[PDB]
Amino acid sequence: GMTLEERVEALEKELQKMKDIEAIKELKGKYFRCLDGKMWDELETTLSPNIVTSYSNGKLVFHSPKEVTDYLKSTMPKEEISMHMGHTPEITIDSETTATGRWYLEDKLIFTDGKYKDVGINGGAFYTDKYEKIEGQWYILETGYVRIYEEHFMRDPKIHITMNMHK
Amino acid sequence: GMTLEERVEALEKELQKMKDIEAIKELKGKYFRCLDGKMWDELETTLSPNIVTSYSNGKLVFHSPKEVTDYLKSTMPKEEISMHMGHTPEITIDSETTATGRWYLEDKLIFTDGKYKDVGINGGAFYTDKYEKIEGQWYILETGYVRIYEEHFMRDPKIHITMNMHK
Amino acid sequence: GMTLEERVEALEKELQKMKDIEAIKELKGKYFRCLDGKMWDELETTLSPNIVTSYSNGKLVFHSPKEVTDYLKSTMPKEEISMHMGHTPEITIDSETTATGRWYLEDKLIFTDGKYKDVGINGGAFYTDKYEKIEGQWYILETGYVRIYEEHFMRDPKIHITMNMHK
Ligand SMILES: [Zn+2]
């Protein structure tokens, strides 16, 4: 049998894992919230300085938080309402400072003014993320996904958007 | 270095926080379930006796669980199917008896009979809640949100609602 | 006071409950992922050997993982895009090896080819599950639900599904 000190040490480490998992869920919650509400400075804080991830089906690859936030902002203008809704996460602590997470995303885009007015886009994806921990704080390091489906369509003009945090 | 007793005491407190967080998520799960299934008496149990929150753009303010439940019920009759779907929470334990939580809501309303038959309403919101703990039980104390968007529209009559817990 | 050894033993048990809850959430995450992505062999691993659950309004009852997976597969062919999206769980550890969970499901079916092309089905449900633990691993034992609503409808042909993991 193990000593008390040994059992406490075990509890310390096991609890740290549970704490790290909550922190990662909280991280990803912030990420979506800041993205869909276009608080770009805040969003930048969720990203590792060592970040490397890609977009436009691998056509574009970015190497810092600045670079990524700048880019997302370009694809998410005022005219575009975004909802990126995360579900049923599967988080795994790979080491004391690294982790992997799967997420299930429903997404929804609605254009209100500008050149793509009334265009609607809906879909789903299985994201897989990598995270890393730096000075006691978790950060997103890599994000990749598999598309479940994507549908593009013209919305009915007779639909009235009665409230909008962006207009 | 800390003593064993001190390290245990730390674990006791740190684990209590993790327990409180789960309890709050469970609370909010019950809240949505009871709201969307119109079990009003059950819903009343999720609310602090000391509750204070507001509605109709701050025009209406309620001061007890009775008062609030009564009100929600008035805005959620049999004729109205509601789905209030919670995502990616960010919970913070502010003290041993208080907490703050952010939630990401997609919402969906469908009217089946009555004066607004075939009306559909969809939206999203970033809720921010305050919770408090009373005799070992968590309760909702304040709820507020920012609307992402709200769309009102007429549904196609050729859609058949084949099942409905309320009719 | 309780002794140190007693306080440690308490922490061991209380933390195990929190660990079990995370495992159950992860389990259900896998279940949805494998179902919607039609990885049937993987899905079979989420199910207790002692599983017993029913379908077609109680008309059909299955007694093993093989039997169930076989069945779901029959109702979920390539032609049918499925999204079963889980929300706001309420998990309760009933014993060291059994548990109960409530889940809030939004669901969405879209048929792309075959005899039901362009048919769309949307709905919601309050699932209630039973889980059991076998050789350190959690498994789904029973699944049942209450339908919130179900809507069937013909989709507009002018909608382009631009991406699809199944085609
Ligand atoms: Zn959702």
Side-chain angles (χ1 to χ4, degrees), chain A residues 1-55 57-58 61-112 114-157 159-166, chain B residues 1-55 57-58 60-157 159-166, chain C residues 1-55 57-58 60-157 159-166:
Chain A
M2 314 175 82
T3 64
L4 273 146
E5 192 177 344
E6 289 168 354
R7 288 162 69 191
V8 171
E9 200 168 340
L11 292 168
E12 287 173 336
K13 297 196 184 184
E14 268 307 317
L15 185 55
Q16 193 52 61
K17 286 169 58 159
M18 298 292 119
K19 279 178 81 182
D20 288 324
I21 290 169
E22 174 57 24
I24 286 156
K25 292 166 166 174
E26 286 184 45
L27 183 68
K28 202 80 184 163
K30 190 187 199 183
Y31 169 85
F32 297 135
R33 184 160 53 78
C34 293
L35 180 64
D36 293 339
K38 312 200 183 308
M39 285 141 175
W40 304 116
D41 289 353
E42 268 278 286
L43 189 141
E44 203 170 335
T45 71
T46 64
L47 306 179
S48 164
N50 302 305
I51 188 162
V52 174
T53 203
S54 69
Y55 294 101
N57 307 337
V61 182
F62 299 100
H63 303 295
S64 81
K66 257 288 152 201
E67 286 190 0
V68 173
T69 312
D70 282 11
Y71 169 75
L72 290 162
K73 182 177 163 158
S74 74
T75 74
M76 294 279 140
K78 170 169 288 192
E79 313 91 56
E80 187 181 327
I81 293 171
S82 41
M83 281 187 71
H84 292 74
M85 283 167 292
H87 308 72
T88 51
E90 308 167 73
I91 310 306
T92 306
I93 306 304
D94 302 315
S95 76
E96 307 194 321
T97 72
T98 64
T100 295
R102 303 175 137 294
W103 291 88
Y104 197 154
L105 269 284
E106 191 180 36
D107 50 69
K108 181 145 181 165
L109 306 177
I110 295 168
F111 288 92
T112 50
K115 58 189 252 169
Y116 302 121
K117 153 175 266 205
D118 286 349
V119 173
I121 298 168
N122 296 321
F126 302 130
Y127 272 71
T128 305
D129 293 344
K130 303 288 195 192
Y131 311 97
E132 80 177 341
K133 199 179 167 157
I134 300 159
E135 272 150 20
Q137 191 69 15
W138 287 93
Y139 293 97
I140 301 170
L141 185 53
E142 186 166 32
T143 204
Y145 67 94
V146 169
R147 259 293 187 202
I148 303 167
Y149 90 111
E150 196 178 328
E151 63 185 341
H152 291 229
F153 61 106
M154 286 286 280
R155 294 160 52 89
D156 187 359
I159 301 163
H160 286 99
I161 296 93
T162 70
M163 279 181 102
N164 186 345
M165 63 177 309
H166 309 303
Chain B
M2 312 176 83
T3 65
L4 271 145
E5 192 175 343
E6 289 168 353
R7 289 161 67 190
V8 171
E9 199 170 338
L11 292 168
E12 288 173 335
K13 296 196 185 184
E14 269 307 318
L15 186 56
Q16 193 52 57
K17 286 169 57 159
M18 298 293 118
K19 280 179 81 181
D20 288 325
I21 290 169
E22 174 58 25
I24 286 155
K25 293 167 166 174
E26 287 184 44
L27 184 67
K28 203 81 184 163
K30 190 187 198 182
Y31 171 87
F32 297 134
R33 184 159 53 79
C34 293
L35 180 64
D36 291 340
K38 312 200 183 308
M39 286 141 175
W40 304 116
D41 290 350
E42 268 278 286
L43 189 140
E44 202 169 335
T45 71
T46 62
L47 306 179
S48 164
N50 302 305
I51 187 162
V52 175
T53 201
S54 68
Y55 294 103
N57 218 333
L60 298 162
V61 182
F62 299 102
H63 302 295
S64 80
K66 257 288 152 201
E67 286 191 355
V68 173
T69 312
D70 280 11
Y71 169 78
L72 291 163
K73 181 177 163 158
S74 72
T75 75
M76 295 283 143
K78 169 169 288 192
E79 313 91 57
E80 187 181 326
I81 294 170
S82 41
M83 279 188 74
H84 291 73
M85 282 168 292
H87 309 72
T88 51
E90 308 167 71
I91 311 305
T92 305
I93 305 304
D94 301 315
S95 75
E96 307 194 321
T97 72
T98 64
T100 296
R102 302 175 139 292
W103 291 89
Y104 197 156
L105 269 285
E106 190 180 34
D107 50 69
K108 181 145 181 164
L109 306 177
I110 295 168
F111 287 91
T112 49
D113 300 89
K115 57 188 253 169
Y116 302 122
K117 153 175 266 205
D118 285 348
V119 172
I121 298 168
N122 296 318
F126 302 129
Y127 271 72
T128 304
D129 294 343
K130 303 288 194 191
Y131 311 97
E132 80 176 341
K133 199 179 167 157
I134 301 159
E135 271 151 17
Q137 190 70 13
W138 287 94
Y139 293 98
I140 300 171
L141 184 53
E142 185 164 32
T143 205
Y145 65 95
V146 169
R147 260 294 186 201
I148 302 166
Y149 90 112
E150 197 178 327
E151 63 185 341
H152 293 229
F153 62 106
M154 285 287 278
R155 294 161 52 88
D156 186 0
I159 300 163
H160 288 99
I161 296 93
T162 71
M163 279 179 103
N164 185 348
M165 62 178 310
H166 309 302
Chain C
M2 308 299 102
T3 66
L4 271 147
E5 191 179 347
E6 287 168 353
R7 289 161 65 188
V8 171
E9 201 166 341
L11 291 168
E12 287 175 335
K13 297 194 185 182
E14 268 308 318
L15 187 55
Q16 193 53 58
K17 285 169 58 159
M18 298 293 118
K19 280 179 82 182
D20 289 325
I21 289 169
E22 173 58 24
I24 285 156
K25 292 167 167 173
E26 286 183 45
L27 183 68
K28 203 79 185 163
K30 190 188 198 182
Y31 169 88
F32 298 133
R33 184 160 53 79
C34 293
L35 181 64
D36 292 340
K38 313 199 183 308
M39 285 141 175
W40 305 115
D41 290 350
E42 268 278 285
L43 189 141
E44 202 170 334
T45 72
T46 63
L47 306 179
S48 163
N50 302 304
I51 188 163
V52 174
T53 202
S54 68
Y55 294 102
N57 306 343
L60 297 162
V61 182
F62 300 101
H63 302 296
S64 81
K66 256 288 152 201
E67 285 190 359
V68 172
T69 312
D70 282 9
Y71 169 76
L72 290 162
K73 181 177 163 157
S74 74
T75 75
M76 295 279 141
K78 170 169 289 192
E79 313 91 57
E80 187 181 326
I81 294 170
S82 41
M83 279 187 74
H84 292 74
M85 283 167 291
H87 308 71
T88 51
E90 308 167 72
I91 310 306
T92 305
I93 306 304
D94 302 316
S95 77
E96 307 193 321
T97 72
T98 64
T100 295
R102 302 174 138 295
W103 291 90
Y104 197 155
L105 269 284
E106 191 180 35
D107 50 69
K108 182 145 182 164
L109 306 177
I110 294 168
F111 288 91
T112 48
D113 300 88
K115 56 189 252 169
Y116 303 119
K117 153 176 266 205
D118 285 348
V119 172
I121 298 168
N122 297 320
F126 301 129
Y127 272 72
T128 305
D129 293 343
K130 303 288 194 191
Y131 312 97
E132 81 175 341
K133 199 179 167 158
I134 300 158
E135 273 149 22
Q137 190 71 13
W138 287 94
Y139 293 97
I140 301 172
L141 184 54
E142 187 164 33
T143 204
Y145 66 95
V146 169
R147 259 293 187 202
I148 302 167
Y149 89 112
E150 196 178 327
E151 63 185 341
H152 291 230
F153 61 106
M154 284 286 279
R155 294 161 52 89
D156 186 359
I159 301 162
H160 285 100
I161 296 93
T162 70
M163 279 176 102
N164 187 345
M165 62 177 310
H166 308 303

Short mmCIF file of all heavy atoms in Angstrom, two decimals, chain A residues 85-87 104 106, chain B residues 85-87 104 106, chain C residues 85-87 104 106, ligand 1:
data_model
loop_
_atom_site.label_atom_id
_atom_site.label_comp_id
_atom_site.label_asym_id
_atom_site.label_seq_id
_atom_site.Cartn_x
_atom_site.Cartn_y
_atom_site.Cartn_z
N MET A 85 -21.25 27.14 -32.65
CA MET A 85 -21.83 26.60 -31.44
C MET A 85 -21.15 25.32 -31.15
O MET A 85 -21.25 24.39 -31.94
CB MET A 85 -23.33 26.44 -31.71
CG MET A 85 -23.97 27.82 -31.61
SD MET A 85 -25.76 27.74 -32.33
CE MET A 85 -25.33 27.43 -34.22
N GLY A 86 -20.46 25.26 -30.01
CA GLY A 86 -19.73 24.03 -29.62
C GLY A 86 -20.51 23.04 -28.78
O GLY A 86 -21.27 23.45 -27.88
N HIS A 87 -20.32 21.75 -29.04
CA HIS A 87 -21.03 20.66 -28.31
C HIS A 87 -20.13 19.48 -27.89
O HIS A 87 -19.11 19.20 -28.53
CB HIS A 87 -22.10 20.04 -29.18
CG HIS A 87 -23.05 21.01 -29.80
ND1 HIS A 87 -22.70 21.85 -30.83
CD2 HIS A 87 -24.38 21.19 -29.61
CE1 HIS A 87 -23.75 22.54 -31.21
NE2 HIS A 87 -24.79 22.15 -30.50
N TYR A 104 -17.65 19.25 -31.33
CA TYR A 104 -18.71 19.10 -32.32
C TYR A 104 -19.36 20.48 -32.54
O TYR A 104 -20.05 21.02 -31.66
CB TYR A 104 -19.71 18.10 -31.76
CG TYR A 104 -20.68 17.46 -32.73
CD1 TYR A 104 -21.23 16.21 -32.46
CD2 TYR A 104 -21.11 18.11 -33.87
CE1 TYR A 104 -22.14 15.62 -33.32
CE2 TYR A 104 -22.02 17.52 -34.73
CZ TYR A 104 -22.53 16.28 -34.46
OH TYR A 104 -23.43 15.74 -35.32
N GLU A 106 -21.90 23.08 -34.69
CA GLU A 106 -22.95 23.50 -35.66
C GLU A 106 -22.54 24.93 -35.93
O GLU A 106 -22.15 25.67 -35.02
CB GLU A 106 -24.40 23.43 -35.07
CG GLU A 106 -25.57 23.61 -36.08
CD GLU A 106 -27.02 23.53 -35.51
OE1 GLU A 106 -27.35 23.97 -34.36
OE2 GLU A 106 -27.89 23.03 -36.25
N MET B 85 -31.18 26.40 -25.98
CA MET B 85 -30.13 25.42 -26.03
C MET B 85 -28.86 26.04 -25.56
O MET B 85 -28.40 26.99 -26.17
CB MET B 85 -30.06 24.94 -27.47
CG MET B 85 -31.20 23.96 -27.71
SD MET B 85 -31.37 23.63 -29.62
CE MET B 85 -31.98 25.42 -30.17
N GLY B 86 -28.28 25.52 -24.47
CA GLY B 86 -27.06 26.09 -23.89
C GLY B 86 -25.77 25.47 -24.40
O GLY B 86 -25.70 24.24 -24.56
N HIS B 87 -24.74 26.31 -24.60
CA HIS B 87 -23.43 25.86 -25.07
C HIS B 87 -22.24 26.49 -24.34
O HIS B 87 -22.32 27.60 -23.82
CB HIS B 87 -23.24 26.26 -26.53
CG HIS B 87 -24.35 25.85 -27.44
ND1 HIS B 87 -25.58 26.45 -27.43
CD2 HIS B 87 -24.39 24.94 -28.44
CE1 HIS B 87 -26.34 25.92 -28.37
NE2 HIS B 87 -25.64 24.99 -28.99
N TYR B 104 -23.66 30.43 -23.82
CA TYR B 104 -23.96 30.70 -25.22
C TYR B 104 -25.28 29.99 -25.61
O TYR B 104 -25.33 28.75 -25.69
CB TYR B 104 -22.78 30.20 -26.05
CG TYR B 104 -22.66 30.71 -27.47
CD1 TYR B 104 -21.43 30.72 -28.09
CD2 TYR B 104 -23.77 31.11 -28.21
CE1 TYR B 104 -21.30 31.14 -29.40
CE2 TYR B 104 -23.64 31.55 -29.51
CZ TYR B 104 -22.41 31.56 -30.10
OH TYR B 104 -22.31 32.01 -31.39
N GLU B 106 -28.45 29.30 -28.27
CA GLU B 106 -29.24 29.35 -29.53
C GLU B 106 -30.66 29.16 -29.03
O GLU B 106 -30.91 28.37 -28.10
CB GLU B 106 -28.85 28.22 -30.53
CG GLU B 106 -29.44 28.32 -31.96
CD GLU B 106 -29.04 27.18 -32.96
OE1 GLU B 106 -28.86 25.97 -32.63
OE2 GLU B 106 -28.94 27.50 -34.16
N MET C 85 -27.04 16.61 -31.67
CA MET C 85 -26.24 17.59 -30.99
C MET C 85 -26.64 17.61 -29.57
O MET C 85 -27.77 17.93 -29.26
CB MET C 85 -26.49 18.93 -31.68
CG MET C 85 -25.70 18.95 -32.99
SD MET C 85 -26.34 20.45 -34.08
CE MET C 85 -28.10 19.79 -34.50
N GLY C 86 -25.70 17.28 -28.68
CA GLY C 86 -25.99 17.22 -27.25
C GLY C 86 -25.71 18.49 -26.47
O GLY C 86 -24.68 19.14 -26.71
N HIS C 87 -26.59 18.82 -25.51
CA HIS C 87 -26.46 20.04 -24.69
C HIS C 87 -26.71 19.82 -23.20
O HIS C 87 -27.46 18.93 -22.80
CB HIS C 87 -27.48 21.09 -25.12
CG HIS C 87 -27.51 21.40 -26.57
ND1 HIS C 87 -27.99 20.52 -27.51
CD2 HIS C 87 -27.19 22.53 -27.24
CE1 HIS C 87 -27.93 21.08 -28.70
NE2 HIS C 87 -27.46 22.31 -28.56
N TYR C 104 -29.90 17.07 -23.41
CA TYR C 104 -30.78 17.87 -24.24
C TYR C 104 -30.28 17.82 -25.70
O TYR C 104 -29.22 18.37 -26.03
CB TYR C 104 -30.75 19.29 -23.70
CG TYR C 104 -31.86 20.22 -24.12
CD1 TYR C 104 -32.20 21.30 -23.33
CD2 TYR C 104 -32.51 20.09 -25.33
CE1 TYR C 104 -33.18 22.18 -23.71
CE2 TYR C 104 -33.50 20.97 -25.69
CZ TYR C 104 -33.83 22.00 -24.90
OH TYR C 104 -34.82 22.86 -25.31
N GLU C 106 -30.76 18.50 -29.80
CA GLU C 106 -31.35 19.06 -31.06
C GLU C 106 -30.90 18.04 -32.10
O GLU C 106 -29.77 17.56 -32.05
CB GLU C 106 -30.84 20.51 -31.42
CG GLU C 106 -31.58 21.27 -32.55
CD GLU C 106 -31.05 22.70 -32.89
OE1 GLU C 106 -29.83 23.02 -32.84
OE2 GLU C 106 -31.89 23.53 -33.26
ZN ZN D 1 -26.63 23.47 -30.42
#
